[PDB]
Amino acid sequence: MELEIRPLFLVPDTNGFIDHLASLARLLESRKYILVVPLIVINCLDGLAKGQAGGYARVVQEKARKSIEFLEQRFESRDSCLRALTSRGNELESIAFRSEDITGQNNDDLILSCCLHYCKDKAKDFMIRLLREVVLLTDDRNLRVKALTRNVPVRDIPAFLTWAQ
């Protein structure tokens, strides 16, 4: 089947935040899109922020801190275009106080499940191209593959931001 793609929900991965926070911020500011952050991503960010250190590690840790700060601020403000999704498929409107991992922890699975949550297919819709309103934002080539073979659209963040105007 062929896809008809109309971006609405955007699902980023951890490195999206580390590498591209400012762009994500811009995307959220646009108000055109719903940014849906897998809860595991936030957890991952929490872990990097905390730490368990070399230069690169320290650099990432700060980037991770900045990302959390961003998220917390936006959620606290009740930003209508920002959501978090649990592993179980629950949308969250607050992240105020998170359950932390015992220790620092590979999340394609869950990221993909997030994306797929917003693929709302019904027998009706086929009695035809496949409507898709979700896009995975990633630089990971393997993750990209997995998404594509699952009929989940993908862009890198730079590419997406550019497209978005």
Swiss-Prot record:
Q: Which residues bind Mn(2+)?
A: D13, D108, D140
According to the entry, every stretch annotated as the PINc domain falls at 8-145
Q: Where in the cell is it found?
A: Nucleus, Nucleolus; Chromosome, Telomere; Cytoplasm, Cytosol
Effect listed in the UniProt record for changing D13N: Loss of endonuclease activity and nonsense-mediated RNA decay
Distribution of this protein across tissues and organs: Ubiquitous.
Superkingdom assignment: Eukaryota
Result after altering D140N: Loss of endonuclease activity and nonsense-mediated RNA decay
Q: What does this protein do?
A: Component of the telomerase ribonucleoprotein (RNP) complex that is essential for the replication of chromosome termini. May have a general role in telomere regulation. Promotes in vitro the ability of TERT to elongate telomeres. Overexpression induces telomere uncapping, chromosomal end-to-end fusions (telomeric DNA persists at the fusion points) and did not perturb TRF2 telomeric localization. Binds to the single-stranded 5'-(GTGTGG)(4)GTGT-3' telomeric DNA, but not to a telomerase RNA template component (TER).
Record note on domains: The PINc domain confers endonuclease activity and is expected to bind the catalytic metal ion.
Subunit text? May form homooligomers. Associated component of the telomerase holoenzyme complex. Interacts with TERT, independently of the telomerase RNA. Interacts with SMG1, SMG5, SMG7, UPF1, UPF2, UPF3B and the PP2A catalytic subunits. Also interacts with the exon junction complex (EJC) composed at least of CASC3, EIF4A3, MAGOH and RBM8A; required for the process of nonsense-mediated mRNA decay. Interacts with DHX34; the interaction is RNA-independent.
- This chain belongs to the protein called Telomerase-binding protein EST1A
Q: Which organism is it from?
A: Homo sapiens (Human)
